[PDB]
Amino acid sequence: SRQIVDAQAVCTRCKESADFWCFECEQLLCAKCFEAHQWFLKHEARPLAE
Amino acid sequence: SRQIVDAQAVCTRCKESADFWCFECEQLLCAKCFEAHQWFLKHEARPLA
Ligand SMILES: [Cl-]
Ligand SMILES: [Zn+2]
Ligand SMILES: [Zn+2]
Ligand SMILES: [Zn+2]
Ligand SMILES: [Zn+2]
């Protein structure tokens, strides 16, 4: 399943602009929510292209 | 900006399973492509996990 991520994509948790994609959660995250995700989970994830 | 994301991380070059992200190439690379990357370039990069 590929997915289109719009230019205005937003974090799945808060309202901030998305910066990361998690391959196992399948979700978009802002930097601050992403740092929490990395503390509590060990998932493959990547920065979004700027 | 506008881009496609996949459920699985695969190398941008060869489509094998990916292991690294390069911030300046903005690319996913498998281990073998990334070793080649390091031979030719010096960029900020991280493993995917
Ligand atoms: Cl992707
Ligand atoms: Zn995750
Ligand atoms: Zn967030
Ligand atoms: Zn490759
Ligand atoms: Zn690079």
List the single residue in B with minimal CA-CA distance to A46.
Answer: B48
Q: Which ligand is nearest to the CA of B18?
A: 4
Q: Quick check: A23 and B4 CB within 8 A?
A: no
Resolution in A: 2.1
Cβ proximity of A38 and A50 under 8 Å: no
Distance CA B7, CA A40 (A): 20
Chain A to chain B, count of Cβ pairs less than 8 Å apart? 48
**One-letter amino acid identity for B15?**
K
Distance CA B22, CA A19 (A): 15
Distance CA B27, CA B6 (A): 13
Distance CA B8, CA A1 (A): 8
Q: How far is the CA of A40 from the centre of ligand 3 (A)?
A: 15
Cβ proximity of A16 and A8 under 8 Å: no
CA torsion sign for A14, A27, A24, B24 is negative
Domain ranges for chain B, please list them. 1-49
